[PDB]
Amino acid sequence: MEEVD
Amino acid sequence: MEEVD
Amino acid sequence: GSHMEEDGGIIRRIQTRGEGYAKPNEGAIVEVALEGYYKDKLFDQRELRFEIGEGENLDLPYGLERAIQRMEKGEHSIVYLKPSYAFGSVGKEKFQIPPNAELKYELHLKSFEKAKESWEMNSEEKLEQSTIVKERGTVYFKEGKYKQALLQYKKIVSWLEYESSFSNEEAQKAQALRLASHLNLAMCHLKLQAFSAAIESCNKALELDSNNEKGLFRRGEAHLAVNDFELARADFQKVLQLYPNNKAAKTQLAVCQQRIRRQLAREKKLYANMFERLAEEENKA
Amino acid sequence: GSHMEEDGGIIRRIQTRGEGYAKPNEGAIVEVALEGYYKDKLFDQRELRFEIGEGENLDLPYGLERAIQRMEKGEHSIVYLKPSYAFGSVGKEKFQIPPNAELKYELHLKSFEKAKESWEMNSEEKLEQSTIVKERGTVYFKEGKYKQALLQYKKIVSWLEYESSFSNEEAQKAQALRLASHLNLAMCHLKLQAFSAAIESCNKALELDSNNEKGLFRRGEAHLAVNDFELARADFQKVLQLYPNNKAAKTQLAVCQQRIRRQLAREKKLYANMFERLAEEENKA
Amino acid sequence: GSHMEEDGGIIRRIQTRGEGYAKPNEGAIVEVALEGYYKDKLFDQRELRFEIGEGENLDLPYGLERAIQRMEKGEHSIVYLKPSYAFGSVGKEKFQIPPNAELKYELHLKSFEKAKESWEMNSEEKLEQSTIVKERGTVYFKEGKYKQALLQYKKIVSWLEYESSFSNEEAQKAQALRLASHLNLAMCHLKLQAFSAAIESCNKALELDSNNEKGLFRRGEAHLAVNDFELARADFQKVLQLYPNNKAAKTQLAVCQQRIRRQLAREKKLYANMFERLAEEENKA
């Protein structure tokens, strides 16, 4: 999945 | 028949 | 066809034949044994497994990829690259290969899974593969390999670009994929300090969400990176309006204000002085 | 070697193959019998006595002159000009010819006399030959054929160029001719609105007489001519320093003043507004 | 407003924001403490005072200078240079930096003296400021730092190009300045073996002092070097004419007469032989 921030 | 100077 | 009129820049000798029925194409997962020499000295020894077109990030001469793209299955051979098809002018340090040098490559192509071409796959397949690719783009990214991540997310925008024989169900499933792609691209570019491209990818994305938190955001980071304060201010100011509880939006919006008023103050005093100077110069009568 | 890169652009059939042994170089004067037909309509017939290189000022095609430079005394012929060598992509309204148009010319090269070429002449001849042309130039000038004068005056500069083998007594003569040649050139360009060139002639002139009244004068004019007041003011202002009784210097200078006052006034007003505006943009807090 | 659409070619991570207000500009003198890394290795570390735009001559990347102009007073920063704004294409063996390569500097703008743009100076100042820069130019030339001397001498010619509100007294103090300027650029170009520019400067000088001994003498020198004898021959001839007790004028006027003499003979034989053959060739019927 796309996360980070 | 040109100029003065 | 038989293109190859690169005037023997790329030449190979079939040391060992080897079954084969088809060849590795663009973006194919190639498994290969590599041996390349300069003058006659060995600089590269290894058995890399990479995607064709990915070679640049893996210290491999442009020419070596087109060569591989012309092999059999378990085929063996050697490639002789003319300077223009191998590190060329820029040469190549960490291998210290002087500009305009030639190379020798002894490559053994093991297996390889050809990259499906847009035409080969129907609607669902494009969606599946669009997925498979993204997964990779994801790994490469979290792994710091931004350029190779680019290679991946792009394949997606490609495949899905024209084809529109999508049922209303696949129509939006695919649209999600596209959007995802563009957002991710912008992400890579920002890492890569490629701010113009970052912005072009945000736009392609906002043409799909025009409200998107990430796109609207990432585009503000790009403007800000190249001192496009005003444009930035606009993007951060908008992200806040749609998402008040957005962390960086507020701070960044602040940076802009700061940089902008200081900018204003600067250019103000300039005209001020420029004005004075004109006056005194005008007084001269 | 005597070949033709023009590739059939200019071809001539020789009927009446006149008194062989001849052929006119460029600058040569020549007497000709015209007869030019469009698709085949006699639109131009006359017995011109022109100098090879000025056909343009006499409604003659580029290829027509070139073609003569290949003819013999008293010889008749017929020249066929491909559109690119006739009146090209403009045609010749005066003859109602369209852009891109082939032509037929039946010419009779009665008489002619070659024109010396730098080498053909010795120190003496050069100064003579240069002095003769300087005259023609002045004639074409008062006669009003500005373009045709530039051509004469230019030969002078070209002749007294690399030919440095002068006896000082000759070197002082050569230079005096070069200077006149330049002032004149600058004088023609002025009449042709070619101010840039007017200015470059004035310079070449001024190198020979850094305080030349006509030089500093004509340049000052070419500047003001292109709304370059500061530089014009410089030259005029400077001319009076050397020639206070100079009439135009005094009137023009004044004009530069007028222009420079309005100009400053405009910008001063401009920087003033630019300020207020900025200030207001800052008040927003 | 001039903002960084270089696309991350130069990006500065302000470590310790410095005071502020105004900042280094084209031509300003900056006190600086730097240190650069290729990929990580410290290839350069020093604190120096250099003039903005003089960097290339002190082994500093084009990019590093631009970055400093955006620095505030005591600012501390980290500049990342893309291979293109830092030894791009060329490289810098002296530091061991491959043609294409990205760099990283840790600048600390200590102090600086903003330069003065043309508009900021009235007739008086411009004249003074030109004279100061003339002095700088001489130190640079005496130390054999020819390229940096050009920068100085060039400023003078620039400030004084459109300045017009002078006044005979000033107007001519400004001419002697310009003239001195061209004479020096010429002198520097000769030293840099840049003969074409040397000749142009001699011309730009002779326009102001038609009989200038150095002007003419240095141009004769430039022509000789490029092997344009007839030309050099005419310049020196003219030098002795106006200044007979001229050391090297007499000396070289000879050299020219000597190389010229040789060419003539060398070319004569050539033509003698050319004729020779044309003859034997006609003897074929």
Short mmCIF file of all heavy atoms in Angstrom, two decimals, chain C residues 90 93-94 96 192-197 225-229 259 262-263 266 269-270 273-274 277 280-281 284, chain E residues 1 3-5 7-8 11-12 14 21 23 39 72 80 82 96 98-100 118-123 163 165 170:
data_model
loop_
_atom_site.label_atom_id
_atom_site.label_comp_id
_atom_site.label_asym_id
_atom_site.label_seq_id
_atom_site.Cartn_x
_atom_site.Cartn_y
_atom_site.Cartn_z
N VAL C 90 30.81 9.59 -22.17
CA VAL C 90 30.90 9.79 -20.73
C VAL C 90 31.81 8.73 -20.12
O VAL C 90 32.18 8.82 -18.96
CB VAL C 90 29.51 9.69 -20.07
CG1 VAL C 90 29.62 10.00 -18.59
CG2 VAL C 90 28.55 10.65 -20.76
N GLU C 93 33.43 5.45 -14.94
CA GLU C 93 34.38 5.27 -13.86
C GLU C 93 33.97 3.99 -13.13
O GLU C 93 33.25 3.18 -13.70
CB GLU C 93 34.34 6.47 -12.92
CG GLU C 93 34.20 7.80 -13.66
CD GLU C 93 35.14 7.91 -14.86
OE1 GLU C 93 36.38 7.92 -14.67
OE2 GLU C 93 34.63 8.01 -16.00
N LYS C 94 34.43 3.82 -11.89
CA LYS C 94 34.11 2.62 -11.11
C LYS C 94 34.28 1.36 -11.98
O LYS C 94 33.92 0.26 -11.58
CB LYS C 94 32.68 2.69 -10.54
CG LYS C 94 31.57 2.98 -11.56
CD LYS C 94 30.25 3.31 -10.87
CE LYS C 94 29.20 3.80 -11.86
NZ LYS C 94 27.92 4.16 -11.19
N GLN C 96 36.41 2.48 -14.73
CA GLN C 96 37.38 3.32 -15.43
C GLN C 96 37.55 2.95 -16.89
O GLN C 96 38.56 2.37 -17.31
CB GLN C 96 38.73 3.32 -14.70
CG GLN C 96 38.68 4.09 -13.38
CD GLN C 96 40.05 4.47 -12.87
OE1 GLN C 96 40.89 3.61 -12.60
NE2 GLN C 96 40.29 5.77 -12.74
N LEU C 192 13.75 12.19 -7.17
CA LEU C 192 14.75 12.45 -8.22
C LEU C 192 15.07 13.91 -8.53
O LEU C 192 15.77 14.19 -9.49
CB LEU C 192 14.33 11.76 -9.52
CG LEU C 192 14.29 10.24 -9.58
CD1 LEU C 192 13.69 9.84 -10.91
CD2 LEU C 192 15.68 9.66 -9.44
N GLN C 193 14.55 14.84 -7.74
CA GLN C 193 14.85 16.24 -7.98
C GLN C 193 14.39 16.68 -9.37
O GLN C 193 14.87 17.69 -9.88
CB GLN C 193 16.35 16.47 -7.87
CG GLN C 193 17.02 15.73 -6.73
CD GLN C 193 16.94 16.48 -5.42
OE1 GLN C 193 15.86 16.87 -4.98
NE2 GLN C 193 18.08 16.67 -4.79
N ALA C 194 13.48 15.93 -9.98
CA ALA C 194 12.95 16.27 -11.31
C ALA C 194 11.61 16.99 -11.13
O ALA C 194 10.57 16.45 -11.46
CB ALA C 194 12.74 15.00 -12.11
N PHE C 195 11.64 18.23 -10.63
CA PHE C 195 10.41 18.97 -10.34
C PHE C 195 9.45 19.34 -11.48
O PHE C 195 8.26 19.55 -11.24
CB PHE C 195 10.78 20.22 -9.55
CG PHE C 195 11.65 19.93 -8.38
CD1 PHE C 195 13.00 20.27 -8.39
CD2 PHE C 195 11.14 19.22 -7.28
CE1 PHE C 195 13.83 19.90 -7.33
CE2 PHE C 195 11.97 18.84 -6.23
CZ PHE C 195 13.32 19.18 -6.25
N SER C 196 9.96 19.42 -12.70
CA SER C 196 9.09 19.75 -13.83
C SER C 196 8.23 18.54 -14.07
O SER C 196 7.01 18.65 -14.23
CB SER C 196 9.91 20.07 -15.08
OG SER C 196 10.37 21.41 -15.09
N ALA C 197 8.87 17.37 -14.09
CA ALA C 197 8.18 16.11 -14.30
C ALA C 197 7.23 15.83 -13.15
O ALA C 197 6.13 15.32 -13.36
CB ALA C 197 9.16 15.00 -14.42
N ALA C 225 9.91 23.77 -4.31
CA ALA C 225 11.30 23.37 -4.47
C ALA C 225 12.06 24.27 -5.42
O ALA C 225 13.25 24.52 -5.23
CB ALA C 225 11.36 21.94 -4.94
N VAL C 226 11.38 24.78 -6.44
CA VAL C 226 12.03 25.62 -7.42
C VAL C 226 11.67 27.09 -7.21
O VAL C 226 11.66 27.88 -8.16
CB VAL C 226 11.64 25.19 -8.87
CG1 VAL C 226 11.87 23.70 -9.04
CG2 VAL C 226 10.18 25.50 -9.16
N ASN C 227 11.36 27.45 -5.98
CA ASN C 227 11.01 28.83 -5.64
C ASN C 227 9.75 29.37 -6.31
O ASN C 227 9.65 30.58 -6.58
CB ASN C 227 12.17 29.77 -5.96
CG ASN C 227 13.26 29.73 -4.91
OD1 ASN C 227 14.30 30.35 -5.07
ND2 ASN C 227 13.01 29.01 -3.82
N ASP C 228 8.80 28.49 -6.62
CA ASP C 228 7.55 28.91 -7.20
C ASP C 228 6.61 29.09 -6.02
O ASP C 228 5.61 28.39 -5.87
CB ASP C 228 6.99 27.85 -8.15
CG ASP C 228 7.23 28.19 -9.61
OD1 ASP C 228 7.14 29.38 -9.97
OD2 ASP C 228 7.49 27.25 -10.40
N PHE C 229 6.97 30.04 -5.16
CA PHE C 229 6.23 30.35 -3.96
C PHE C 229 4.76 30.60 -4.23
O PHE C 229 3.92 29.90 -3.68
CB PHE C 229 6.86 31.55 -3.27
CG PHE C 229 8.29 31.34 -2.91
CD1 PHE C 229 9.24 32.34 -3.13
CD2 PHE C 229 8.72 30.12 -2.38
CE1 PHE C 229 10.58 32.12 -2.83
CE2 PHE C 229 10.06 29.89 -2.08
CZ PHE C 229 10.99 30.89 -2.31
N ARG C 259 8.83 33.23 2.79
CA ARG C 259 9.60 33.53 1.60
C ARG C 259 8.97 34.62 0.74
O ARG C 259 9.69 35.43 0.14
CB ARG C 259 9.83 32.26 0.78
CG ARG C 259 10.61 31.17 1.52
CD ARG C 259 12.06 31.56 1.82
NE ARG C 259 12.90 31.58 0.63
CZ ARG C 259 14.20 31.89 0.61
NH1 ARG C 259 14.83 32.21 1.74
NH2 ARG C 259 14.88 31.88 -0.53
N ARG C 262 9.21 38.28 2.49
CA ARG C 262 10.59 38.72 2.47
C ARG C 262 10.94 39.09 1.04
O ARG C 262 11.68 40.04 0.78
CB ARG C 262 11.51 37.62 3.00
CG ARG C 262 11.32 37.42 4.49
CD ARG C 262 12.28 36.44 5.13
NE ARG C 262 12.07 36.41 6.58
CZ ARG C 262 12.75 35.65 7.43
NH1 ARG C 262 13.69 34.83 6.99
NH2 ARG C 262 12.48 35.72 8.73
N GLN C 263 10.37 38.35 0.10
CA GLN C 263 10.60 38.62 -1.30
C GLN C 263 10.04 40.01 -1.57
O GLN C 263 10.71 40.87 -2.13
CB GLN C 263 9.87 37.58 -2.15
CG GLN C 263 10.09 37.68 -3.64
CD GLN C 263 9.45 36.52 -4.39
OE1 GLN C 263 8.23 36.36 -4.38
NE2 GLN C 263 10.27 35.70 -5.02
N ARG C 266 12.01 42.90 -0.28
CA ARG C 266 13.20 43.10 -1.10
C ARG C 266 12.90 43.91 -2.36
O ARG C 266 13.49 44.96 -2.59
CB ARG C 266 13.77 41.74 -1.50
CG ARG C 266 15.16 41.79 -2.11
CD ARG C 266 15.53 40.43 -2.67
NE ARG C 266 15.15 39.35 -1.76
CZ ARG C 266 15.20 38.06 -2.06
NH1 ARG C 266 15.61 37.67 -3.26
NH2 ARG C 266 14.83 37.16 -1.16
N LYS C 269 11.97 47.83 -1.76
CA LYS C 269 13.08 48.76 -1.55
C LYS C 269 13.86 49.01 -2.82
O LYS C 269 14.52 50.04 -2.95
CB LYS C 269 14.02 48.22 -0.47
CG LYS C 269 13.34 48.07 0.87
CD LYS C 269 14.32 47.67 1.95
CE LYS C 269 13.61 47.56 3.30
NZ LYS C 269 14.54 47.20 4.41
N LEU C 270 13.79 48.08 -3.76
CA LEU C 270 14.50 48.24 -5.02
C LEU C 270 13.92 49.38 -5.82
O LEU C 270 14.63 50.33 -6.16
CB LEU C 270 14.45 46.97 -5.85
CG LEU C 270 15.10 47.13 -7.22
CD1 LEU C 270 16.47 47.71 -7.06
CD2 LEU C 270 15.17 45.80 -7.93
N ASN C 273 14.61 52.71 -4.28
CA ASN C 273 15.91 53.28 -4.62
C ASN C 273 16.01 53.61 -6.10
O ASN C 273 16.56 54.64 -6.48
CB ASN C 273 17.02 52.30 -4.25
CG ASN C 273 17.14 52.11 -2.76
OD1 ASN C 273 17.22 53.08 -2.01
ND2 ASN C 273 17.15 50.85 -2.32
N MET C 274 15.48 52.72 -6.94
CA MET C 274 15.53 52.96 -8.36
C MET C 274 14.85 54.29 -8.64
O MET C 274 15.28 55.06 -9.51
CB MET C 274 14.81 51.85 -9.12
CG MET C 274 15.57 50.55 -9.17
SD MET C 274 15.29 49.76 -10.75
CE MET C 274 14.19 48.43 -10.28
N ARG C 277 17.12 57.30 -7.47
CA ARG C 277 18.13 57.46 -8.51
C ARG C 277 17.63 58.15 -9.77
O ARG C 277 18.37 58.91 -10.39
CB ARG C 277 18.75 56.12 -8.87
CG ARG C 277 20.09 55.90 -8.21
CD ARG C 277 21.23 56.06 -9.20
NE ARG C 277 21.35 57.40 -9.75
CZ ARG C 277 21.81 57.67 -10.98
NH1 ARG C 277 22.18 56.69 -11.79
NH2 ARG C 277 21.91 58.93 -11.38
N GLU C 280 17.15 62.17 -8.83
CA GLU C 280 18.43 62.88 -8.88
C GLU C 280 18.96 63.00 -10.30
O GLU C 280 19.49 64.05 -10.68
CB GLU C 280 19.49 62.19 -8.00
CG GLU C 280 19.85 60.77 -8.41
CD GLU C 280 21.27 60.35 -8.00
OE1 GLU C 280 22.24 60.96 -8.51
OE2 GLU C 280 21.42 59.42 -7.18
N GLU C 281 18.80 61.94 -11.09
CA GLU C 281 19.27 61.93 -12.47
C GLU C 281 18.41 62.86 -13.32
O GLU C 281 18.88 63.42 -14.32
CB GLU C 281 19.23 60.50 -13.02
CG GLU C 281 19.90 60.35 -14.38
CD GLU C 281 21.38 60.72 -14.35
OE1 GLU C 281 21.91 60.99 -13.25
OE2 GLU C 281 22.01 60.74 -15.42
N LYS C 284 19.15 66.75 -13.07
CA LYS C 284 20.22 67.26 -13.93
C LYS C 284 19.66 67.96 -15.17
O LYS C 284 19.30 67.32 -16.16
CB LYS C 284 21.14 66.12 -14.36
CG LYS C 284 22.30 65.83 -13.41
CD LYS C 284 23.30 64.91 -14.08
CE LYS C 284 24.65 64.95 -13.40
NZ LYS C 284 25.67 64.20 -14.19
N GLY E 1 9.23 35.69 -10.98
CA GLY E 1 10.33 36.62 -10.64
C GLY E 1 11.68 35.94 -10.54
O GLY E 1 12.19 35.72 -9.44
N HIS E 3 12.55 32.93 -10.75
CA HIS E 3 12.76 31.76 -9.91
C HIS E 3 12.90 30.33 -10.35
O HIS E 3 12.02 29.69 -10.92
CB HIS E 3 11.85 31.85 -8.71
CG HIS E 3 12.23 32.97 -7.79
ND1 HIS E 3 13.55 33.30 -7.52
CD2 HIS E 3 11.46 33.83 -7.06
CE1 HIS E 3 13.58 34.32 -6.67
NE2 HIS E 3 12.33 34.66 -6.37
N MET E 4 14.08 29.87 -9.97
CA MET E 4 14.63 28.55 -10.15
C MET E 4 13.92 27.58 -11.06
O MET E 4 13.48 26.53 -10.61
CB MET E 4 14.78 27.90 -8.78
CG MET E 4 14.91 28.92 -7.64
SD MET E 4 16.47 29.83 -7.57
CE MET E 4 16.35 31.12 -8.97
N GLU E 5 13.77 27.92 -12.33
CA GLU E 5 13.18 26.93 -13.20
C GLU E 5 14.34 26.30 -13.95
O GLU E 5 14.37 26.23 -15.18
CB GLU E 5 12.14 27.54 -14.13
CG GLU E 5 10.75 27.41 -13.51
CD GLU E 5 9.64 27.34 -14.53
OE1 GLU E 5 9.75 26.53 -15.51
OE2 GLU E 5 8.63 28.09 -14.35
N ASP E 7 15.16 23.48 -12.62
CA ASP E 7 14.72 22.14 -12.29
C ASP E 7 15.69 21.41 -11.37
O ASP E 7 16.34 20.45 -11.79
CB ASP E 7 14.51 21.33 -13.56
CG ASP E 7 13.27 20.47 -13.49
OD1 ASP E 7 12.17 21.03 -13.25
OD2 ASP E 7 13.38 19.24 -13.69
N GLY E 8 15.79 21.88 -10.13
CA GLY E 8 16.66 21.27 -9.14
C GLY E 8 18.15 21.18 -9.47
O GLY E 8 18.87 20.44 -8.80
N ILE E 11 20.00 23.17 -5.47
CA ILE E 11 19.05 23.19 -4.38
C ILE E 11 19.82 23.40 -3.09
O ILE E 11 20.80 22.70 -2.84
CB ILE E 11 18.30 21.87 -4.32
CG1 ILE E 11 19.29 20.72 -4.50
CG2 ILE E 11 17.23 21.84 -5.40
CD1 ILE E 11 18.66 19.41 -4.95
N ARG E 12 19.42 24.38 -2.28
CA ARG E 12 20.14 24.62 -1.04
C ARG E 12 19.35 24.34 0.23
O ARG E 12 18.27 24.90 0.46
CB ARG E 12 20.70 26.06 -1.02
CG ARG E 12 19.68 27.17 -0.91
CD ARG E 12 20.36 28.52 -0.76
NE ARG E 12 19.41 29.60 -0.52
CZ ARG E 12 18.38 29.87 -1.31
NH1 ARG E 12 18.17 29.15 -2.40
NH2 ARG E 12 17.57 30.88 -1.02
N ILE E 14 19.27 25.12 3.59
CA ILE E 14 19.74 26.09 4.58
C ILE E 14 19.91 25.49 5.97
O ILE E 14 18.94 25.32 6.70
CB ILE E 14 18.77 27.28 4.68
CG1 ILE E 14 18.64 27.95 3.31
CG2 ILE E 14 19.26 28.27 5.73
CD1 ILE E 14 17.74 29.16 3.31
N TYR E 21 18.35 40.48 4.66
CA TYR E 21 18.20 41.79 4.03
C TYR E 21 18.59 41.65 2.56
O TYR E 21 17.81 41.15 1.75
CB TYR E 21 19.08 42.84 4.72
CG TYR E 21 18.45 44.21 4.89
CD1 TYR E 21 17.24 44.36 5.58
CD2 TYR E 21 19.07 45.35 4.40
CE1 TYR E 21 16.69 45.62 5.79
CE2 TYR E 21 18.52 46.62 4.60
CZ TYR E 21 17.33 46.74 5.30
OH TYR E 21 16.79 47.99 5.52
N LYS E 23 21.64 40.45 -0.46
CA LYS E 23 22.52 39.32 -0.66
C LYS E 23 23.43 39.42 -1.89
O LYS E 23 23.11 40.11 -2.85
CB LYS E 23 21.70 38.03 -0.69
CG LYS E 23 20.47 38.05 -1.56
CD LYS E 23 19.65 36.79 -1.29
CE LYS E 23 18.49 36.64 -2.25
NZ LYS E 23 17.74 35.38 -2.00
N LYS E 39 31.12 12.33 -4.39
CA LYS E 39 30.01 11.45 -4.10
C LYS E 39 29.97 11.34 -2.59
O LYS E 39 29.04 10.77 -2.02
CB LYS E 39 30.21 10.07 -4.73
CG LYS E 39 29.92 10.00 -6.23
CD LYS E 39 29.90 8.57 -6.76
CE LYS E 39 29.55 8.53 -8.24
NZ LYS E 39 29.45 7.14 -8.79
N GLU E 72 22.01 34.58 2.25
CA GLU E 72 21.90 35.77 3.06
C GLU E 72 23.12 35.86 3.97
O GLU E 72 23.77 34.85 4.24
CB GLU E 72 20.62 35.75 3.92
CG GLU E 72 19.32 35.84 3.12
CD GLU E 72 18.09 36.00 4.01
OE1 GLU E 72 17.87 35.15 4.90
OE2 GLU E 72 17.34 36.98 3.80
N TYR E 80 23.48 21.22 -3.40
CA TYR E 80 23.61 20.00 -4.17
C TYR E 80 23.58 20.42 -5.63
O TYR E 80 22.60 20.99 -6.11
CB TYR E 80 22.46 19.04 -3.85
CG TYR E 80 22.39 18.62 -2.40
CD1 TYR E 80 21.47 19.22 -1.53
CD2 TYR E 80 23.26 17.67 -1.88
CE1 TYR E 80 21.43 18.87 -0.18
CE2 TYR E 80 23.23 17.31 -0.53
CZ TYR E 80 22.31 17.92 0.32
OH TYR E 80 22.26 17.59 1.65
N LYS E 82 23.65 19.49 -9.63
CA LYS E 82 23.40 18.46 -10.61
C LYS E 82 24.53 18.50 -11.62
O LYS E 82 25.01 19.57 -11.97
CB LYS E 82 22.07 18.70 -11.32
CG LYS E 82 20.82 18.45 -10.49
CD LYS E 82 19.58 18.50 -11.39
CE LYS E 82 18.33 18.03 -10.66
NZ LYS E 82 17.14 17.99 -11.57
N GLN E 96 39.84 15.33 -9.52
CA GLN E 96 39.44 13.99 -9.90
C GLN E 96 37.93 13.94 -9.85
O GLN E 96 37.34 13.44 -8.90
CB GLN E 96 40.05 12.96 -8.93
CG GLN E 96 39.95 11.50 -9.38
CD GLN E 96 40.79 11.20 -10.63
OE1 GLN E 96 41.99 11.47 -10.66
NE2 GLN E 96 40.15 10.63 -11.65
N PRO E 98 34.97 13.03 -12.71
CA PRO E 98 34.53 12.52 -14.01
C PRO E 98 33.64 13.52 -14.73
O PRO E 98 32.87 14.23 -14.09
CB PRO E 98 33.77 11.26 -13.65
CG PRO E 98 34.54 10.77 -12.46
CD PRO E 98 34.75 12.02 -11.66
N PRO E 99 33.74 13.58 -16.07
CA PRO E 99 32.94 14.49 -16.89
C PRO E 99 31.56 14.76 -16.31
O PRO E 99 31.28 15.86 -15.81
CB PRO E 99 32.90 13.77 -18.23
CG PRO E 99 34.30 13.23 -18.32
CD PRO E 99 34.53 12.67 -16.91
N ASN E 100 30.69 13.76 -16.36
CA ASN E 100 29.35 13.90 -15.79
C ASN E 100 29.43 13.45 -14.34
O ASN E 100 29.87 12.34 -14.05
CB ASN E 100 28.35 13.03 -16.55
CG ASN E 100 26.94 13.15 -15.99
OD1 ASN E 100 26.31 14.20 -16.10
ND2 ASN E 100 26.44 12.07 -15.39
N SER E 118 24.80 49.24 -12.69
CA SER E 118 25.02 50.50 -13.40
C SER E 118 24.10 51.64 -12.92
O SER E 118 24.58 52.71 -12.54
CB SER E 118 24.85 50.29 -14.90
OG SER E 118 25.35 51.40 -15.62
N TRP E 119 22.79 51.40 -12.92
CA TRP E 119 21.83 52.42 -12.50
C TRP E 119 22.12 53.03 -11.13
O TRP E 119 21.80 54.18 -10.90
CB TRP E 119 20.41 51.85 -12.50
CG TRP E 119 20.21 50.71 -11.54
CD1 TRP E 119 20.44 49.39 -11.77
CD2 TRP E 119 19.76 50.81 -10.17
NE1 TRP E 119 20.17 48.65 -10.64
CE2 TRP E 119 19.75 49.50 -9.64
CE3 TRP E 119 19.37 51.88 -9.35
CZ2 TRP E 119 19.37 49.23 -8.32
CZ3 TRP E 119 18.99 51.61 -8.04
CH2 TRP E 119 18.99 50.29 -7.54
N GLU E 120 22.72 52.27 -10.22
CA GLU E 120 23.04 52.76 -8.88
C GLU E 120 24.13 53.85 -8.84
O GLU E 120 24.39 54.43 -7.78
CB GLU E 120 23.49 51.60 -7.97
CG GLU E 120 22.40 50.62 -7.55
CD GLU E 120 22.89 49.55 -6.55
OE1 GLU E 120 23.72 48.69 -6.92
OE2 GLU E 120 22.44 49.56 -5.38
N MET E 121 24.77 54.14 -9.97
CA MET E 121 25.87 55.12 -9.98
C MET E 121 25.74 56.33 -10.88
O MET E 121 25.51 56.19 -12.08
CB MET E 121 27.18 54.42 -10.36
CG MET E 121 27.55 53.21 -9.54
SD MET E 121 29.10 52.51 -10.10
CE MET E 121 28.58 51.47 -11.49
N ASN E 122 25.94 57.52 -10.32
CA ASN E 122 25.89 58.73 -11.13
C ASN E 122 27.22 58.93 -11.86
O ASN E 122 28.18 58.21 -11.61
CB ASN E 122 25.57 59.95 -10.26
CG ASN E 122 26.55 60.15 -9.12
OD1 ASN E 122 27.76 59.94 -9.26
ND2 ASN E 122 26.03 60.57 -7.98
N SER E 123 27.27 59.91 -12.76
CA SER E 123 28.48 60.19 -13.53
C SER E 123 29.77 60.13 -12.70
O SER E 123 30.73 59.48 -13.10
CB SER E 123 28.37 61.57 -14.16
OG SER E 123 27.12 61.72 -14.79
N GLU E 163 26.14 55.31 -20.47
CA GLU E 163 26.14 56.48 -19.61
C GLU E 163 26.29 57.68 -20.53
O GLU E 163 27.23 57.76 -21.32
CB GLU E 163 27.29 56.44 -18.61
CG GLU E 163 27.31 57.65 -17.69
CD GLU E 163 25.94 57.96 -17.10
OE1 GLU E 163 25.38 57.10 -16.39
OE2 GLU E 163 25.41 59.07 -17.36
N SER E 165 24.71 61.24 -19.45
CA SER E 165 24.65 62.50 -18.72
C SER E 165 26.02 63.02 -18.29
O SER E 165 26.15 63.74 -17.30
CB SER E 165 23.73 62.38 -17.50
OG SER E 165 24.16 61.37 -16.61
N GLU E 170 33.77 65.30 -17.94
CA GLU E 170 33.52 63.91 -17.60
C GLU E 170 33.52 63.07 -18.86
O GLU E 170 34.16 62.02 -18.93
CB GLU E 170 32.18 63.75 -16.90
CG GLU E 170 32.01 64.63 -15.70
CD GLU E 170 30.79 64.27 -14.87
OE1 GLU E 170 29.69 64.09 -15.45
OE2 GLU E 170 30.92 64.18 -13.63
#
